Ligand binder design. Structure first.
Ligand SMILES: Cn1cc(-c2cnc3[nH]cc(-c4cnn(Cc5cc(F)ccc5F)c4)c3c2)cn1
Length: 250
């Protein structure tokens, strides 16, 4: 099924997080000390905003999965490290990028169930970045450690509207510039806070239009939340608005 690439052709260059690799083509190598199936899931996707599975090395040990090299690393760490001391449109492109990928999943009736900044990767760190969904461990596991801050109330049900909720929270992560959702609240506090109707305030300097996308992502009833086509449409509207784009980051 998956393209078994000879170990002879594979060489490990550098430890990234989890290796920088080459094949006799610069790739990223994920090693195993289940795992047969994250690669099988990622392999079946064909979209520009989802990391590509180059191949696998299950012949020798330790078993590899060859993946599209994302030199910019995860999105959570990027926001943190690249915090002004980067413009609003850079955030909007990142948001659009993941929204496209989510739309692709939604169209293909796949539920991610863990859409967060820590599961998104960046191609290069500088301008011309492309954010892509890099982790699918949660959706595999099914097919304290639970991501409660990204989950809607009815999650124990899971829909495409689940991913809509978590994307709203991802949206906050982006425009907060990498802050932890519900900053001073624990999983159980957030659980009861959300269940009561409580929602996160706008991140510092966040334009109203963008916060309004977060707000309707967090609608209590799933059928009232927007699909990702509408979300993109609305992100595109923000990208047209100059009052949104001209707003200076904190
Ligand atoms: C600084 N930094 C860069 C990276 C990085 C760069 N490029 C990358 N390309 C693919 C990855 C990656 C790493 N883990 N995953 C999740 C994953 C986990 C798994 F168990 C099986 C497959 C799989 F894709 C994707 C990946 C990670 C990690 N840290």
């Amino acid at each position: 099924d998956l393209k078994e690439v000879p170990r002879k052709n594979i060489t490990l260059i550098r430890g990234l997080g989890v290796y920088e690799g080459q094949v006799s083509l610069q790739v990223a190598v994920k090693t195993l000390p289940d795992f047969l199936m994250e690669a099988l899931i990622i392999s079946k996707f064909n979209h520009q905003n989802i990391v590509r599975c180059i191949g696998v090395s299950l012949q020798s040990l330790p078993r590899f999965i060859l993946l599209e090299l994302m030199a910019g690393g995860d999105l959570k760490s990027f926001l943190r490290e690249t915090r002004p001391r980067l413009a609003m449109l850079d955030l909007l492109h990142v948001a659009r990028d993941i929204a496209c990928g989510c739309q692709y999943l939604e169209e293909n009736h796949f539920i991610h169930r863990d859409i967060a900044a820590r599961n998104c990767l960046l191609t290069c760190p500088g301008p011309g970045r492309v954010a892509k969904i890099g982790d699918f461990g949660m959706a595999r596991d099914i097919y304290a450690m639970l991501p409660v801050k990204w989950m809607p109330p009815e999650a124990g049900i899971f829909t495409s509207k689940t991913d809509t909720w978590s994307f709203g929270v991802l949206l906050w992560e982006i425009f907060s510039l990498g802050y932890m959702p519900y900053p001073s609240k624990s999983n159980q506090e957030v659980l009861e806070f959300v269940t009561s109707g409580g929602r996160m305030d706008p991140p510092k300097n966040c334009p109203g239009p963008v916060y309004r996308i977060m707000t309707q992502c967090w609608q209590h009833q799933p059928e009232d939340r927007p699909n990702f086509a509408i979300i993109l449409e609305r992100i595109e509207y923000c990208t047209q608005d100059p009052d949104v784009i001209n707003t200076a980051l904190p």
